């Protein structure tokens, strides 16, 4: 089990790249903001996380306007081998239109 | 919406403490295993109140199913922490 669901705004949207096998790959920077209750107390949560799309989601998310609201889900992986930093690997994403 | 569901093994289980409000608090280190190399996801988790009592003194190596929200370890930190809202053994 490894699945993160998150609502966020696109803070940065990289240039479209491709793997050697020609697969589209895109890196984005997402910023999440919300209030949550912890142990029975209110708490502001502001999370910035790097996310990677590969394949069809990369094509879908390519050139997303900055500030765009999104709803994504995917799995967490270390940024780099043995890294304590984490990156979200997108499996689902949808661009919300205000 | 900010919810992470994760199966993991307890790599580190800290000593239980208490916040300035007398609330029980515990810090653990969890490791999740995935395939393609040997992908090893490590995640620092924090348990409060009742969950801290449940997880306190958990033997290392123990398999857990956890759920909660992610937040930065601190102001502008590049590191994250999983704030546990649910957790269960085996």
Curated annotation (Swiss-Prot), chain A:
Keywords: DNA replication, DNA-binding, Primosome. InterPro entries: NA-bd_OB-fold, Primosome_PriB/ssb, Prisomal_replication_PriB. SUPFAM superfamilies: Nucleic acid-binding proteins. It holds the Pfam family SSB_1. Homodimer. Interacts with PriA and DnaT. Component of the replication restart primosome. Primosome assembly occurs via a 'hand-off' mechanism. PriA binds to replication forks, subsequently PriB then DnaT bind; DnaT then displaces ssDNA to generate the helicase loading substrate. Belongs to the PriB family. Involved in the restart of stalled replication forks, which reloads the replicative helicase on sites other than the origin of replication; the PriA-PriB pathway is the major replication restart pathway. During primosome assembly it facilitates complex formation between PriA and DnaT on DNA; stabilizes PriA on DNA. Stimulates the DNA unwinding activity of PriA helicase. This is Replication restart protein PriB.
Curated annotation (Swiss-Prot), chain B:
One of its GO terms (biological process) is DNA replication, synthesis of primer. Keywords: DNA replication, DNA-binding, Primosome. PROSITE patterns: SSB. Residues 1-90 form the SSB domain. Pfam families: SSB_1. It comes from the Bacteria. GO terms for molecular function: single-stranded DNA binding. GO terms for cellular component: primosome complex. Homodimer. Interacts with PriA and DnaT. Component of the replication restart primosome. Primosome assembly occurs via a 'hand-off' mechanism. PriA binds to replication forks, subsequently PriB then DnaT bind; DnaT then displaces ssDNA to generate the helicase loading substrate. Belongs to the PriB family. Involved in the restart of stalled replication forks, which reloads the replicative helicase on sites other than the origin of replication; the PriA-PriB pathway is the major replication restart pathway. During primosome assembly it facilitates complex formation between PriA and DnaT on DNA; stabilizes PriA on DNA. Stimulates the DNA unwinding activity of PriA helicase. NCBIfam families: PriB_gamma. This is Replication restart protein PriB. It comes from Bordetella pertussis (strain Tohama I / ATCC BAA-589 / NCTC 13251).
């Amino acid at each position: 089990m490894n699945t993160l669901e998150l609502s966020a705004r696109v803070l940065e949207c990289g240039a479209m790249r491709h793997t050697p096998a020609g697969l589209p790959a895109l890196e984005l920077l997402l910023v999440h903001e919300s209030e949550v209750v912890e142990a029975g107390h209110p708490r502001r949560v502001e999370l910035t996380i790097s996310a990677v799309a590969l394949g069809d989601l990369a094509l879908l998310l390519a050139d997303t306007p900055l500030g765009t609201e999104m709803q994504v889900q995917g799995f967490l992986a270390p940024a780099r081998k043995d890294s304590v930093k984490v990156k979200l690997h997108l499996q689902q994403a949808r661009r919300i239109a205000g």
